[PDB]
Design a protein around this ligand. Structure first.
Ligand SMILES: O=C(NC1CC1)c1ccc(-c2cnc3c(NCc4cccs4)nccn23)cc1
Ligand SMILES: [Cl-]
Length: 258
């Protein structure tokens, strides 16, 4: 089982994901290095879908030079029939790593948050609001967390959830960078307390209710890191105008004082 891309040949080791007409494979080049190749079948694809994938590739190419907390794109090939993207392969996604972990190391949680902030900061500077951040969107490679996509095209499922949905995303059924702060908050909450803020409410219709509800209060058990407590509280403010910004989160003692 092989894949060729712009001259070069690759052996499929394992399929790691699949979505709308796309598949992500862990593969090897001739020198026995590991990559992740994404394949998209374009045969039965809208002009909307095509344009979203074109928009994804352009943004991923551009955003290469600006942060190394964005997945590396080594090469790509696009025709009317398919797209191949040769990207970095990670060790493990952040969702799978959080589910395997007993207790999160305080220094390693702070390192990861820094990484997430840098990645999301970067896409914001180029006018992208992701809008659907989850642990599944971050990948552990080398020592660092990297963002793997931009919420531009359809997300890959591993081979959903509303636990990270911001209140204004539910309230706007009748886009701000503050929306990414909420979701990033929820990942940090999970990294801190072992649960997302509303992971206790199993009913999805009931889950959407607590997120929008001012009179529902999120609990914050006290911890050694009083800075971390505060970061969590400012990210998880229901009113987006009063919610903390990425550039503020970067000036925050939790991230600055070592
Ligand atoms: O589609 C992606 N990004 C859009 C901008 C183009 C995308 C999807 C998956 C990956 C990727 C690259 N590496 C991984 C990975 N690695 C852990 C593994 C799981 C199984 C074998 S390795 N798990 C999940 C996803 N991985 C990178 C980019
Ligand atoms: Cl912001």
């Amino acid at each position: 089982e092989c894949i060729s891309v712009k001259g070069r040949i690759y052996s499929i080791l394992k399929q790691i994901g699949s979505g709308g007409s796309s598949k992500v494979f862990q593969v090897l080049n001739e020198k026995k290095q590991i990559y992740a190749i994404k394949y998209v079948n374009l045969e039965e694809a809208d002009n909307q879908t095509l344009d979203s994938y074109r928009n994804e590739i352009a943004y991923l190419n551009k955003l290469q030079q600006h942060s190394d907390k964005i997945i590396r794109l080594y090469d790509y090939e696009i025709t009317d029939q398919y797209i191949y993207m040769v990207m970095e392969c990670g060790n493990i996604d952040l969702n799978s790593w959080l589910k395997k972990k007993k207790s999160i190391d305080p220094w390693e949680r702070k390192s990861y948050w820094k990484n997430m902030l840098e990645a999301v900061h970067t896409i914001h500077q180029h006018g992208i609001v992701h809008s659907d951040l989850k642990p599944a969107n971050f990948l552990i490679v080398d020592g660092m967390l990297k963002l793997i996509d931009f919420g531009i095209a359809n997300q890959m499922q591993p081979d959903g959830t509303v636990n990270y949905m911001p209140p204004e995303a539910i309230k706007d059924m009748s886009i701000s960078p503050k929306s990414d702060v909420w979701s990033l908050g929820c990942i940090l909450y999970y990294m801190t307390y072992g649960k997302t803020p509303f992971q206790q409410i199993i009913n999805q219709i009931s889950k959407l209710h607590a997120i929008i509800d001012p009179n529902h209060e999120i609990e914050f058990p006290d911890i050694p890191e009083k800075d971390l407590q505060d970061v969590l509280k400012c990210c998880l403010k229901r009113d987006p105008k009063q919610r903390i910004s990425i550039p503020e989160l970067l000036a925050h003692p939790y991230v600055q004082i070592q």
